[PDB]
Design an enzyme around this catalytic site. Structure first.
Site, PDB file in Angstrom:
ATOM      1  N   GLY A  48      31.691  23.175 -19.938  1.00 17.31           N
ATOM      2  CA  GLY A  48      32.748  22.416 -20.586  1.00 17.31           C
ATOM      3  C   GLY A  48      33.368  23.248 -21.683  1.00 17.31           C
ATOM      4  N   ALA A  49      34.266  22.646 -22.453  1.00 19.46           N
ATOM      5  CA  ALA A  49      34.973  23.303 -23.552  1.00 19.46           C
ATOM      6  C   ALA A  49      34.179  23.891 -24.689  1.00 19.46           C
ATOM      7  CB  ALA A  49      35.997  22.349 -24.126  1.00 19.46           C
ATOM      8  N   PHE A  50      32.869  23.951 -24.563  1.00 17.44           N
ATOM      9  CA  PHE A  50      32.066  24.504 -25.638  1.00 17.44           C
ATOM     10  C   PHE A  50      31.060  25.485 -25.105  1.00 17.44           C
ATOM     11  CE2 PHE A  50      33.621  22.515 -29.331  1.00 17.44           C
ATOM     12  CZ  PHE A  50      33.857  21.160 -29.120  1.00 17.44           C
ATOM     13  N   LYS A  52      28.251  26.345 -21.361  1.00 11.51           N
ATOM     14  CA  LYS A  52      27.769  26.124 -20.012  1.00 11.51           C
ATOM     15  C   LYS A  52      26.249  26.095 -19.953  1.00 11.51           C
ATOM     16  CE  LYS A  52      27.648  31.126 -18.887  1.00 11.51           C
ATOM     17  NZ  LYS A  52      28.077  32.113 -17.847  1.00 11.51           N
ATOM     18  N   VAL A  53      25.747  25.679 -18.803  1.00 11.00           N
ATOM     19  CA  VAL A  53      24.321  25.607 -18.584  1.00 11.00           C
ATOM     20  C   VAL A  53      24.193  26.105 -17.158  1.00 11.00           C
ATOM     21  CG1 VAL A  53      24.897  23.167 -18.604  1.00 11.00           C
ATOM     22  CG2 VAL A  53      22.629  23.866 -17.827  1.00 11.00           C
ATOM     23  N   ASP A 166      24.998   7.835 -26.198  1.00 13.02           N
ATOM     24  CA  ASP A 166      25.784   8.165 -25.019  1.00 13.02           C
ATOM     25  C   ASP A 166      25.000   7.881 -23.764  1.00 13.02           C
ATOM     26  OD1 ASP A 166      27.643  11.141 -23.919  1.00 13.02           O
ATOM     27  OD2 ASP A 166      27.576   9.078 -23.145  1.00 13.02           O
ATOM     28  N   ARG A 170      25.697   9.131 -15.995  1.00 13.32           N
ATOM     29  CA  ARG A 170      26.071  10.542 -15.902  1.00 13.32           C
ATOM     30  C   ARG A 170      25.126  11.424 -16.726  1.00 13.32           C
ATOM     31  NH1 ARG A 170      29.489   7.809 -18.862  1.00 13.32           N
ATOM     32  NH2 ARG A 170      29.742   8.334 -21.077  1.00 13.32           N
ATOM     33  N   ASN A 171      24.341  10.793 -17.606  1.00 14.44           N
ATOM     34  CA  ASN A 171      23.386  11.486 -18.470  1.00 14.44           C
ATOM     35  C   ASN A 171      21.961  11.332 -17.985  1.00 14.44           C
ATOM     36  OD1 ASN A 171      25.172  12.501 -20.423  1.00 14.44           O
ATOM     37  ND2 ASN A 171      25.148  10.561 -21.557  1.00 14.44           N
ATOM     38  N   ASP A 184      21.256  14.620 -22.566  1.00 13.93           N
ATOM     39  CA  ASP A 184      22.643  14.687 -22.979  1.00 13.93           C
ATOM     40  C   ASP A 184      23.168  15.942 -22.281  1.00 13.93           C
ATOM     41  OD1 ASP A 184      25.120  14.494 -24.127  1.00 13.93           O
ATOM     42  OD2 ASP A 184      24.483  15.249 -26.083  1.00 13.93           O
TER      43      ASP A 184
HETATM   44  C1  LIG Z   1      23.881  19.614  -9.906  1.00 15.05           C
HETATM   45  C2  LIG Z   1      22.742  19.627 -10.852  1.00 15.05           C
HETATM   46  C3  LIG Z   1      22.784  19.595 -12.253  1.00 15.05           C
HETATM   47  C4  LIG Z   1      21.482  19.803 -12.712  1.00 15.05           C
HETATM   48  C5  LIG Z   1      21.135  19.865 -14.180  1.00 15.05           C
HETATM   49  C6  LIG Z   1      21.991  19.731 -15.340  1.00 15.05           C
HETATM   50  C7  LIG Z   1      23.446  19.337 -15.255  1.00 15.05           C
HETATM   51  C8  LIG Z   1      24.457  20.310 -15.007  1.00 15.05           C
HETATM   52  C9  LIG Z   1      25.810  19.909 -14.925  1.00 15.05           C
HETATM   53  C10 LIG Z   1      26.170  18.552 -15.103  1.00 15.05           C
HETATM   54  C11 LIG Z   1      25.177  17.585 -15.367  1.00 15.05           C
HETATM   55  C12 LIG Z   1      23.822  17.971 -15.445  1.00 15.05           C
HETATM   56  C13 LIG Z   1      21.375  19.966 -16.715  1.00 15.05           C
HETATM   57  C14 LIG Z   1      22.146  19.912 -17.925  1.00 15.05           C
HETATM   58  C15 LIG Z   1      21.552  20.179 -19.178  1.00 15.05           C
HETATM   59 CL1  LIG Z   1      22.527  20.133 -20.575  1.00 15.05          CL
HETATM   60  C16 LIG Z   1      20.182  20.499 -19.285  1.00 15.05           C
HETATM   61  C17 LIG Z   1      19.393  20.558 -18.117  1.00 15.05           C
HETATM   62  C18 LIG Z   1      19.988  20.296 -16.842  1.00 15.05           C
HETATM   63  N1  LIG Z   1      19.200  20.402 -15.696  1.00 15.05           N
HETATM   64  C19 LIG Z   1      19.642  20.218 -14.403  1.00 15.05           C
HETATM   65  O1  LIG Z   1      18.822  20.328 -13.471  1.00 15.05           O
HETATM   66  O2  LIG Z   1      20.723  19.916 -11.552  1.00 15.05           O
HETATM   67  N2  LIG Z   1      21.495  19.811 -10.414  1.00 15.05           N
END
Ligand SMILES: Cc1cc(-c2c(-c3ccccc3)c3cc(Cl)ccc3[nH]c2=O)on1
Length: 303
Positions: A48-50, A52-53, A166, A170-171, A184
């Site tokens: 996002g705008a800040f 990535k993960v 929040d 979606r969380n 989050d």
């Molecule tokens: C498709 C998808 C996504 C995810 C995971 C995350 C995720 C990524 C993108 C949007 C929503 C959630 C996620 C996010 C954060 Cl901030 C910490 C840990 C974590 N872990 C996951 O496994 O797994 N599979």
């Protein structure tokens, strides 16, 4: 657009846990540190705008040298002091809470060697919303488990005086064996373009927010319970968008304050729906507690 951390630790007394310190104020526990030279970057799970993960593999994480998959929270280069520090306030807040099965836990960090990377758990079946939207065969119980699981983690953040602010499907991720886990995912989502976050001059998931927070910027565990109800709705409506058709605006506001509630979802048993109503009570003191909700969803031992 300001980063800003959602999660917060507040001061509660009569509660069954006393807040003797505010982690974000000083702590830095260097016992979470991990060699960034043993972390292998996979693909980008989201951004996002800040920041990535991204997915990644950690070689030798913990006291058991496991080599499991992980999700590395991280900021962009464009980042600046403030942002850089917000990220740290979230780590400390993480290092304080401890680890619960129904929460995306902290596994490690890399505060030294360059950019700070927060190594969190990795959940393989993705978020709960998108999951319901693809499985419309889910069982009436499959749903009933996510509700108690989510309710459980929220019982935990509550038992540490930690508010979410929040809570929404979606969380909620889904890890092995389809176990839920609140967290989050601010970094991984692009709030600038998500119509669920209305502008505030910040970005707030209004349709989820309690009336007390929309009107008086008051965030209590009780605010959380309300949103939690909004979540039970998304679960049984199998992923519909709160207040379907209704638009977030002046009229909407008068509706929610005047006691309006979303009609019962198609798959929600009467009792469960009765949880939503309680969670949506107009006055905070009358909403249940995540523990009562937890225990109640339990009483459904009828099976
Ligand atoms: C498709 C998808 C996504 C995810 C995971 C995350 C995720 C990524 C993108 C949007 C929503 C959630 C996620 C996010 C954060 Cl901030 C910490 C840990 C974590 N872990 C996951 O496994 O797994 N599979």
């Amino acid at each position: 657009p300001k980063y800003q951390v959602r999660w917060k630790i507040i001061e509660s007394y009569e509660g069954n846990s006393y807040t003797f310190i505010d982690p974000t104020q000083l702590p830095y526990n260097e016992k979470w540190e991990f060699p960034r030279n043993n972390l292998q970057f996979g693909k980008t799970l989201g951004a996002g705008a800040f920041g990535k993960v991204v997915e990644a593999t950690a070689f030798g994480l913990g006291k058991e040298d496991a080599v499991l998959k992980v999700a590395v929270k991280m900021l962009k280069s464009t980042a600046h002091a403030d942002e850089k520090e917000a990220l740290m306030s979230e780590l400390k807040i993480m290092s304080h809470l401890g680890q619960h099965e129904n929460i995306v836990n902290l596994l490690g960090a890399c505060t030294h060697g360059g950019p700070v990377l927060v190594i969190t758990e990795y959940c393989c079946y993705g978020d709960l919303l998108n999951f319901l939207r693809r499985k419309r065969q889910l069982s009436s119980r499959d749903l009933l488990h996510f509700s108690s699981q989510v309710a459980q983690g929220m019982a935990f953040l509550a038992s540490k005086n930690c508010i979410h602010r929040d809570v929404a499907a979606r969380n909620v991720l889904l890890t092995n064996g389809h176990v839920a886990k609140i967290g989050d995912f601010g970094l991984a989502r692009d709030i600038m373009n998500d119509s669920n976050y209305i502008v505030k001059g910040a970005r707030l998931p209004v349709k989820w927010m309690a009336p007390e927070s929309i009107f008086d910027c008051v965030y209590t565990v009780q605010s959380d319970v309300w949103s939690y109800g909004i979540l039970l709705w998304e679960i049984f409506s199998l992923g519909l968008n709160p207040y379907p058709g209704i638009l977030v605006n002046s009229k909407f506001y008068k509706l929610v304050k005047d006691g309006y509630q979303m009609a019962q979802p198609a798959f929600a048993p009467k009792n469960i729906y009765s949880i939503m109503q309680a969670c949506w009570a107009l006055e905070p003191t009358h909403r249940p507690t995540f523990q009562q909700i937890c225990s109640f969803l339990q009483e459904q031992a009828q099976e």
